[PDB]
Amino acid sequence: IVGGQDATRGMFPYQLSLQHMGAGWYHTCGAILLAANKALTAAHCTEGREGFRVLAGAHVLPANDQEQESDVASVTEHPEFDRFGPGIPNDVATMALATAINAAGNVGYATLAAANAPDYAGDQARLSGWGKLHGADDGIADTLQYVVTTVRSTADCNARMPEHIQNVMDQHICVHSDTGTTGSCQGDSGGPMTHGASGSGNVIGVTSWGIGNPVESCLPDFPSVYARVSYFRAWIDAN
Amino acid sequence: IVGGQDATRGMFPYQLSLQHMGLLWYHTCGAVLLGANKALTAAHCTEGRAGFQVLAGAHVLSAGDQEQSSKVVTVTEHPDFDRFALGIPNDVATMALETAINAAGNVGYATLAVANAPDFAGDQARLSGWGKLLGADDLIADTLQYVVTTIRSTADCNSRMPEHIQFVMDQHICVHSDAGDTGSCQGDSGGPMTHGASGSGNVIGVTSWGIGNAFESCLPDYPSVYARVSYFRAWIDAN
């Protein structure tokens, strides 16, 4: 998260750390807790890989301070996900959890946007995650971050993109500040966009992509693009 | 190298594999043999690191049958190298070798561009190295690659970049194919750009940077950017 600040523990009860087994476990993406044995993330976070765990109720990743955890037993990526397609289409996946994660302590389940939700253009929303604090940094964040930003319409999103990368679609929900100073970054992918500037809010997006250059991987000068939960809600529910 | 083919051993007599000691030795960058005890690479290949060796007259890395090698005693990075500044300026370094490497067999010393050399805009050139064969691949190349491409002027270079990445400078030399299919890739940094499409050619650039995204780390749809040897020749000779 670029341009944000430390969250407090429990501020995003459904925020997960999605961990991949390399040499040992490492944070690769965010994820979103939906139910005791179900979670939601970006398809690109799991596609082509195997060996995952989610941490629930965590705050400072190097402290190993999670409250609950479960192995991921199975993953369903959207069948029309295309890692290399314009706009990274259909960048959503559900995950089945081996062990139940209970709504307790600082852990809780997200309320997803309804399929008939409005598009929220102009609304304040929050991005959260352990992604890099700046696109040039070599490491991800130690402490969970969040930032308040503004949802834009599809047309507005594309107007804010590079001229040859006008690939934002209605299946996306994009945020951008008018100062060009906040956004998501590597390590935030698969996490939640929470509606509203404060308090409890529905989860309306899943972190997916943004724009970089050779010295800064996630430019707040350009929007951050999420998979739109209302567009994918029926599919998420069916999978 | 993207869009290229297997080279032959000795095709580029001055091409080195710059190895870094981690778990075991591994290829981290290219380098360019300048003389019996001296090599050239990119500053970002050596800055902040130590414990290097160069392999000369190599071909297939897994074969381990380079003709000659040497540990590196010390490295010197350009004093104005800036990994964060637009254009990653001054990305050159020299290296002193513990063991003399002879010009013999498939190993020879580069002829560097003189400081009076022109821009070479429009000319063909060759890129060589063990970088990845595609930006979406996980691993570097096993067999040394090369590709023929076309040198572009500073202004033409920038015209072929994204509008928010107009970072090419006169201290760079860039190459780009109109078909958008050739370029350097991670693992190629530090290696040579050789003037001309065939024959003995002077070394006119050092591999430095290119455009990527989170799923494809090098994009031949945009130019590949090298440090221009003519610009840096006096520094290289003195260091």
Numbering used by the authors:
A (entry chain B), B (entry chain A): 1 to 239
According to the publication:
Moreover, snFPITE-n2 consisted of two molecules (A and B) in an asymmetric unit. snFPITE-n2-B (molecule B) was the same as snFPITE-n1, but 28 amino acids differed between molecules A and B. These two molecules formed a heterodimer through hydrogen bonding with two separate catalytic triads available for substrates, indicating that snFPITE-n2 could function comparably to snFPITE-n1. This unique structure of snFPITE-n2 might shed light on preventing the loss of activity through dimerization or polymerization during freeze–thaw cycles. Prior to crystallization, the protein samples were treated with the serine protease inhibitor phenylmethylsulphonylfluoride (PMSF). High-resolution crystal structures of both snFPITE-n1 and snFPITE-n2 reconfirmed that their catalytic triads consisted of His44, Asp91, and Ser189, and the weak substrate specificity might be caused by Gly183 and Ile88 residues in the binding pockets S1 and S2, or the four additional residues (Cys, Leu, Pro, and Asp) inserted into the S1 pocket of snFPITEs. The presence of snFPITE-n1 and snFPITE-n2 implied that more snFPITE sequences might exist in S. nudus.
Here, we introduce a small facultative plasminogen-independent thrombolytic enzyme, snFPITE, isolated from Sipunculus nudus. Compared to traditional thrombolytic agents, snFPITE does not require plasminogen for thrombolysis, although its presence enhances lytic activity. Native/SDS-PAGE, high-resolution mass spectrometry (HRMS), and ultrahigh-performance liquid chromatography (UHPLC) unveiled that snFPITE was a small monomer protein with a molecular weight of 24.925 kD.
